[PDB]
Amino acid sequence: PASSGLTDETAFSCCSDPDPSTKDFLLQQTMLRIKDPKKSLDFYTRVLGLTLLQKLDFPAMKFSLYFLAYEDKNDIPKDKSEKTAWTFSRKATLELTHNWGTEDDETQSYHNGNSDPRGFGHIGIAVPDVYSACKRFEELGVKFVKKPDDGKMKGLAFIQDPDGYWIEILNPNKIATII
Amino acid sequence: SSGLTDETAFSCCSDPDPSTKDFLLQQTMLRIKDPKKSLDFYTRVLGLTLLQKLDFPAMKFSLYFLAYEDKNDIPKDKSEKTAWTFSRKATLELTHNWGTEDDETQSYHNGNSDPRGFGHIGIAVPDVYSACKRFEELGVKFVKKPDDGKMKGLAFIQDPDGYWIEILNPNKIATII
Ligand SMILES: COc1ccc2c(c1)c(CC(=O)O)c(C)n2C(=O)c1ccc(Cl)cc1
Ligand SMILES: [Zn+2]
Ligand SMILES: [Zn+2]
Fold this sequence. Notes:
In chain A, 20% of the residues lie in helices and 27% in strands.
């Protein structure tokens, strides 16, 4: 029997109610390696409107971590120790990992997971209006993987960040209409 | 090299444009070889809830959406359920291309060897050691046990596809550095 995927029945049959030990777990971060934080920080804050919660430097291992999320900057504790506990307890953050030097190495680039070898596909952002968001993205020179009305999924877009990671742009209140 | 000073890094950040007002980081998507194994892992092992499943037979794949949400908060009718799912923060979209689970020569790439890119998702938990003790008991595979290395109290496990999952305690991170 050629795979026709799971029925809803099988799928949900594979699903267990959370064990009480897992009751306070949260999905805290998605980590992506970045070649050049100057570009990545600009894109994510200025184009997408995230806020840089914290920059952590690790001299012993020659990398930095940049945590970005949709949070009000006024909410960030100034104190380093308090900043840390707050940042790592936010939901839905991006951890951008910068291995020092990569920005100056012409031979280096990271792989976005969407060609051989595939794996990771993208992160995704819900917006109140995909068409207006993308017109703005266009005016800002953002590279598109899929414009909102190209292809057969109309009203859905994919853009790329400076490393070429894909970012889905969607309106959650209009997805059902395109299945 | 040396990496960015705070001045350089901070100067590259703009305040949010008002038009990005209620933008939210909604999903991270991973391709998965076997949804039976994945769904068991994320729900039973990790404690996420499957919010919704979408099939696209035309293109031979399913999308599964999981989050740390109460399933009693999931709308029954399809339209309303879709709109809610896609408006939850911090979801996981697992993409199953029909066939792969029967193909012995097939595996996805977790981004942690050449060519590198994506690294991991990370779970904030109350107690990394009790969490990993349970994972161990349950047969979960580890990359970094909580107590190995210079950064003790922080772990990395693998999902059924080999993607790394960080296990951290927010109240012990600053200490760990
Ligand atoms: C400076 O030396 C380091 C720094 C980070 C490290 C490690 C060693 C090791 C290896 C080791 O612990 O020896 C692991 C696994 N690290 C991490 O991935 C990590 C990521 C984010 C945070 Cl905030 C903390 C740790
Ligand atoms: Zn991490
Ligand atoms: Zn997606």
